Each structure stands twice: as C-alpha cells, then as structure tokens.
Amino acid sequence: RTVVRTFDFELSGYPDETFRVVLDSVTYELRFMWNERDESWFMSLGDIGAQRPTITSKLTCYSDILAPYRYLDNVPDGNLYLWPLGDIRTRAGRFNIGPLKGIQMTYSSLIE
Amino acid sequence: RTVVRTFDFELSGYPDETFRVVLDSVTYELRFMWNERDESWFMSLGDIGAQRPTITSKLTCYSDILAPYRYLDNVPDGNLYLWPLGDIRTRAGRFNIGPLKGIQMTYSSLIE
Amino acid sequence: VMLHAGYNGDEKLIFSGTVEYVEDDFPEETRTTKFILGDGTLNLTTATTARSYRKGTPVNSVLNDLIADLKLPKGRVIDFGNQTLQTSMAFTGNASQNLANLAKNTGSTFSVQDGAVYWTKEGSRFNVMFEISEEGGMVGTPTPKQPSSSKKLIKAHDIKEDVGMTVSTLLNGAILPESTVYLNTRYHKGFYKVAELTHRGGYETGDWITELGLVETRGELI
Amino acid sequence: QTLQTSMAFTGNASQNLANLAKNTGSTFSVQDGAVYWTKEGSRFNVMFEISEEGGMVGTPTPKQPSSSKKLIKA
Amino acid sequence: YADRYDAAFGIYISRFLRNNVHTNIRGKVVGVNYSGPSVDVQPMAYTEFPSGTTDRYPVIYDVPVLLPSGAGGKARLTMPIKPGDVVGLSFSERNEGDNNDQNTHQLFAGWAVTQIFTDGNS
Amino acid sequence: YDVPVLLPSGAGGKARLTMPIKPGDVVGLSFSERNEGDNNDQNTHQLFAGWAVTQIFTDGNSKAIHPDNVVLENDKAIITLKPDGDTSLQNPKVTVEALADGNVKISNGTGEFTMSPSGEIKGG
Amino acid sequence: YADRYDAAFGIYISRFLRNNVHTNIRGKVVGVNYSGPSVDVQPMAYTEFPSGTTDRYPVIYDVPVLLPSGAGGKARLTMPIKPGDVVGLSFSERNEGDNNDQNTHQLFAGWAVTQIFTDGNSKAIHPDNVVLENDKAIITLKPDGDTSLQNPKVTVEALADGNVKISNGTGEFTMSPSGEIKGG
Amino acid sequence: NYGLTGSGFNLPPMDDLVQETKKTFKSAFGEDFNTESNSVADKLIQIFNEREYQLWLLMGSVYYAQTMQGAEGIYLDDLLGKRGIYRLGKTRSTGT
C-alpha cells in the first residue's frame, strides 16, 4: 500500500475551530473541540452542509484514526496520523500542533 | 543550410533578468543569471509556464549554443550565436551585450 | 497598435491588436480621440474551415489540424494523448467556434490572448511565477468573490473551477489570464489560477493598477 | 433586371424587402411616413450648405460610420 | 443602419444561424457502403462573401440510407445505389451516436433519401 | 414553385419507380438552409425549397393498409407478394398466380393453363 | 468566460434552442395503426448533464406515414409495417392540426419515413439489382433483361435470350429462343 | 531544484539558501528560535552561508568546462585537442 504525503494541518488553539479542507479532490468540513478534563482534541468529520458529522473520534499520536472507517463512500481512503517532531515521548497538546510547534498532523494518499 | 537573421537580443545587466520572446512564431521564456567567479552569463530556456527549464547552458562567443539540442519538439531549429562588433579578441561581459555595446547576440532561422 | 507601461525605468507590453474603431470630437477647448482595440479580432471572426474525420481517428490529430487553420502562433498546448474519436465528425464555419465546442466535451480551455493561442485543461494549473505581498505593491487585502454571476446545480465534472478570489496590484503587464500566482498575505495563503485581468490607467490623474480575478484549482499539477 | 431563381415571400413585408436590399445593393428605409428606396454608394444637387453663416456649431471632425471594421479584399 | 439597439441583435442572430442550426441540405454520394447501407455525402451549396472568402461544407461520413421497408426489415426494396447519385440530406438535432455531447444541430447526419430529381439530372 | 420530387432510384437514374403523380396529392415539403440555385445569396432558410416526398397519408385521405403484404397496385392492376412464397398478378379479366407448392395457374376468362406440383401440365 | 457581454447571449441562445426548435430526430415505432396509416414514435437520443440530470423525449402519437404513391392514392406501395421498425421523424413548423396555436416547432409531428438502415439493424444490399422481396417471395429484375419470380417451391424466370422456364417441383414448362415449346 | 537536473546545471541565489538553513535551525529548536538581525546564531549562519555560494558557483563553472560551450583557457585546448587543432604561438610578420 504505497502512500505519499500530500497535506498538513495546523491549529490555532481556539477551542471550537471549524474550517473546510479539500482532500483527494473531494471537499470536507472539519470540527475540532478541546476537552478540559481529558486534555485532548475531539475531531468530527462530515460532508459540506451535512446535518450531522459522519465520523467522530479522539486524536492520539501514532494511531490510525481512519482505520475502521474505510468502508464509506464519503470517507478519505488515505492515512491520517499525528507524530511528533521533537522528543518521541511528547503527547498531543493544545498549542503544540503544527508544522513547527512540535506535533505534525498529516494526511497521505495512496498512489492511484 | 541557408539561414537568415531574424532577431537580436539586448541585456540590461541585471543579474537575474527574465523575459518572454517569440521565435519562429513560437513563444519561449528565457532566464539569464550572472556568475561572479566565472564572470559569464548562464542561459535557461523552456516553455511558457513550464515547471523546469528544458535547456541550460553557458554563453560563449562563436559557439553554437543549440547544436546538441536540435532533436526536441520545443527547441528552436535556428542558429544562436554571440559574436563581437569591435575587436575580435573581446570576450562576453556583463554590460557589453547589445546591438551597439560590443557583443551582438543574434538568432537566425533556416529558410522554410 | 502596441501599448507599453511601467515606472520610469522600463515598460512592459500591455496590449497589441488592431484598431477596430476610431472617432474624434473637438468641442471648443479640447479634442478627445477614442479607440477600441481587438486582440486578434480579425482572425477569430473570419477563419473558415471545412474538415471531417472517420471513426477511429486520434483526437490529438484533430486538435492540431484545426489550430493550424486559425493562423496564429501556438502559445501553449496540452495534447490529449492516445484519445480517439468515438463518432464521425464534421466541422465548418469559423474555426474558433468549432474549437470552443470541442472544449465543452473534453474539459479543455481555449482562448487567444496577445496573439498567442493557449489550450489548457480545466481544473488543473501549471511554479510560483508571481508572488503577491505588501512588498509586491499589493493594494488592500484580498476578498472572496464568486467567479460567476450564477450558481449551477450540483450532484451534492467535479474538477471544474467553481471558486475564486480577488486581488488588486500596481500595473504590471507581465501577467496573463492562464498563468499561476502565489498569494502571500497575512490572512490568505496558497496558490491560485488567474481567470480575468483588467488594466486601468490615468497618466496625469487616475489609478495605475491592475485587477486579477483568481480561481481555486483542484486538478493535477500539469 | 430579371429574377434568376424562383422566389417566395411571407411574413412581414418590411423584413422581406430588407433582405432584398442586401443582395442588390439597395437601401430601404421608411421615414416621416415616406418610403425611400435608393442605391448604396451613389447619391442624389447641393440641397443644403453648411458654413459659419449657416449656424454651424464647431468644426467638423472625422468619425467612423460604424462601430466595427469589415474585412476587405485589399 | 447600425445605430439602433435592435439591429445589433438582428445581425448577431443572423450570424449565429450561419455557423449552427443546420437542418437540411442537398448533396451527392461519393462513397457507398453496401454492407449496412451507408453513403458519404458532399453538400453542393456554398456562398462567397464580399471580402473574397468562401464557405465549403466538408465531406460527411456514414449517413444511413432509407428504403421503403417493414416487418422488421424482412420486406425491402433494395435498389442498386451508385456513387454520384444526387440525394437530399437531413441533420439530427442531437448526436444520436453519443449521449454526452453538449452541442445541438452540429452537423449530426440523420439520414439520406434514395434520390432527388433536380435540374441537370431530370 | 418547382420543388424537385424524390423517387426511390439509383445506378445514376437507370433504376427508378416512377409513379403517376397527379395534382392534389398531399405531400410533405422540406426547405434547404441555403439557396442551392445561387451562390451569392446572403440569407438563410428563406423558403428555399429543397425537395418533396411522394405522398403522406394524413387524416382525410387515409387509405387502408394491408396488415401483412407488399402490394404494388395501380388503378386496376395489382401485384401481390405474400411472405409464404405465393405471388400473384391480378386484373379484372386475367390472373397469373405462382403459389408456394409448385402450383402455376395462369388463367383467363376464355380459358386457363395450370401445372400441378406432381408435374402435371394441363390446358383448360 | 462569463464576463463578456456576447458570451451571455451565446449561452442564452444555446439554452433556448435546447427547449425548442425541434427539426428532425430518429425513433422506433411502438404503436401502429393500419386504418389511416399512422405510427407512434419513441425518439432514441438523449443526453445527461453534469448535474446528474437527464432529458428524455416523450412518446409521440399519430405521426402520418409516407409511402410512394400518386394519382390520388390509387397507386401506392403499402408494405407491412410492424412495431419496432426504426424510422426517422420530422417536426412541422406549425401545428397543422390547429389554426390558433401561437407557438412554433413545439414537437408538432409532421410525418415519418418507412425505414432507415442504421447500425444494429443494417441489412445487406445487393450491389446491383432491384430486388422487391417479402418473407419468402422475391421479385428480382436484373439490368440485362432477365426477370425472375421465386419462392421455395415455384420459379418463373424470363431471361434475356427469349427463354421462358416456368417451373415447379411437380414439373416444368419452357420455351426456347428457337421457338420450341415443351412440357416437363 | 538548483543542482543537477534534466536540463543541465543551474545556480541558486543567496536568499534561498539562507531561508532553507534558517528553516532547518527553526526545526532544530522549535518555532521560538530567533534568526533575524540580532541573533548571534544569525550572524554565524549568514556569514557561514555566503561561502558556499562561492562553492556552488565554482562547481557550476567546472561542469561546463567539458562541453562544446563554456570551455576556456587550458580546458579549451583539451576539448578541441581531440580534433587535432592547436593554438598558434607568437608569429613574425613577413613581406617584401
């Protein structure tokens, strides 16, 4: 399953960010919510103007977020991962997500 | 191989000039870079909006620049030469290129 | 007629064509000459053609045959590859009209500009040939503007356009509709195609700026 | 002059006449109730003279008679 | 002449029909296929503008030929067509050979009649 | 005036089915895009008659049609071919039928001649 | 693209012709009336827009059928039309069935042709012969004088050289150019 | 992009190298590292960078030394020496 890096993300730290992104020539809308007690980011994925999000999950490092969901016509077939740029023991935080902040959220697409 | 003079060039001396020219009814974009240590002009040739230049070479007097490259569909079939107007021993410089500056960069096209 | 403009040290070609119209009015104090110029109007509106092809003909051959009829230099073309006609075809009338019809059914953009023929594919774009920033004489912040005055029904080819933005800059004739630009601002950042240009100028009094209508891209990087 | 091929005319009479104008170099136009049929290029005496005595207003200026240019055999 | 607003639309519509909206035209057979009867038609009409320019129709390929027949093609009067026969040609509104074409009336040959007796071959 | 009439024909006009057209027959008319009689006309679709079809059976002149038979007919002379081999020429005083079963029955009011499938030859 | 003033009229005219100005179209017979010959036509062509929308012509009722005829309908070649035959259809400019309609070209069926030999139903054609044929009854005339009537058990040929060979499975009768008369 | 490509040898400006190495430093110590004007690291990196510009220019000069165009001086003789042509030395005028 050859895959190539094709997109990177950044977060400003606002607890209720929402924006639209284009992946594999298809367009999706994303929502990020910050959880206080669990100090983690909650990601919701869905179609543009959809009544409810298609997928909701909790973000973690080195875990394949989309693994159990590559069976729907509206879910990207690529790979979405979070891995750190600094010390390997650093876990995902609020302000430490970005191309140079410490954690590299990235999307990669299979070659077809 | 009958050939007729059909175009002349001039350079303002700026070290990173880039402009578009039309030859044989086809259009190309040219880049000129000045080298300090080698005191010579580097010419790059390519198609309009091309990702990378098709040809790169170093300019010299009385040398057929395009000689080894008349086998591509996007390279002019004419003749490109640099010859001096003054003393024959003068070599190409920075500010001495032009119709009256001392060196005559010229393009000539075969008769068909 | 040719027109040049710039800033006291150089002048870039900004238009070239034929004088379609001319009139003079001289009421009392000041005469005012008027012009209307067309970029290749004569060729695009009189070049007749009469061609035909059979089943199995490679489409790449049809394209080259029709363009040579138009009698204009080829600025840039993206061939079709190994595409072949599915049905017999016949072409007559103005060559430009026939080519513009082939555009719809094959997702290709055809448009002549400053004498150069440009044939490209919709959705895809060409390097950062231009960068826009406060250093690059930008004028005001970019704003999002729809690229068409109407909305189309959608299934919600997907690759087609449908989005854009607007920017303004000091006059710079070294730009063309089919080029690509990079937008380095503080809010918006990314790559865009160009779709429309408008050059304005008042020598003694008036603006000396250019307006670009950008369109988002979603295709391959041709 | 004689017709070279059979002809048929229907619809508004004005439209049919305006079509006969193109193929025979004639100008057709109604004005203040009067029908005028003339031939293009040719003209009728000095029925009017323009000069400063004749209440002219400003000098004449050359203006093209159409907003577009046609291809010519030149 | 060209000042009114309506005359502009008149000329624009007149010119628009010139390059489209092909409905019917006469022609002559130049190529004949006997298996799956079809004929190649060369339209005869043309015009010359005052600017010394001419408009020629191109050769049209594989126009189906109609014959009086029925009962699923079991009964038919198959006459021996030859090249050079003068026939009338009709153009279909849509490209019946494809379902994705966006144009209309763009020289989509519909069918041809067996023969027409005009001047010169009456 | 003068719309050319089409007839099923070929081979350069050597083969043609010239039926006897009369005034009053109902036909469909087609108009050509350009004036095929001239090469200088600037107009288009201006009632340039292209051609006319032999006849069209509309309301008010709808003749009956045989459900299954290729009948070529004249005022009183009829040629009928049926799918089952049989062919027949008829007229108010003669009949020449060739049936499927090897039957020939050339007949007339004054007499008849026939051949049976069994090879018989008789003269009535 | 959509900025010029002329492109707007171009698109408007292109869209206007789409819903009107019907001139000709192919079709297939689905309903046949033998008294006062008329046929129901189902046009075959269609298109699918990028927005996932389709355009279908509806069934057209009672299009008159043309046949080679004359003399006030006394002479006519009435072939046995059946449902499913592929025919070409023509639309009249005005509603010939009414004199008050204000529209034009609005699918006013004009007439239909007997049959058209397109791809998928292309019957073979004899290079040189005027063959009038039925299911099993054939009439063949050849340029060289010879004429022949055939069927699976009879044959009546009249050749160029004065030969008459009226024949049958049970026997034959013939006349030679030399004036001979024989009965087989 | 600026090194060896499919169409010969190119030349990079100074600013691209400066930005690339500054990005590398940024990645080394996070986005907070300062690299402009007042940084001692800035004064070291910029001074360091200009020298490799000379190296790149000299390398580019070397490549063309073995081509029909660009040869000069001693290197020119080797190119045309393959075809048996040698420069002429000092000459004495002759006449009558």
Place this chain on the structure above:
Amino acid sequence: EDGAVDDSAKQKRQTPYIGKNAETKERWENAAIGTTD
C-alpha cells in the same frame, strides 16, 4: 505554509531530520506516511 508539501509547490528542499531516535522513526513514517514524490 510552514511545513512540507509547500516546498514541493514552491520547489524547495525538505528539511533533514536531526537523527535522534533513528531507525525507529524512519521505519514507521516511511511506511505509514511515505514521501512526497
């Protein structure tokens, strides 16, 4: 615009890694992320 994929658009060089924990990263990103090519 602060990380890779823009360099491929801007036609620049990817930043080399600083080596630490080598042979642990390279096996995983190269298989799960790949390279922009």
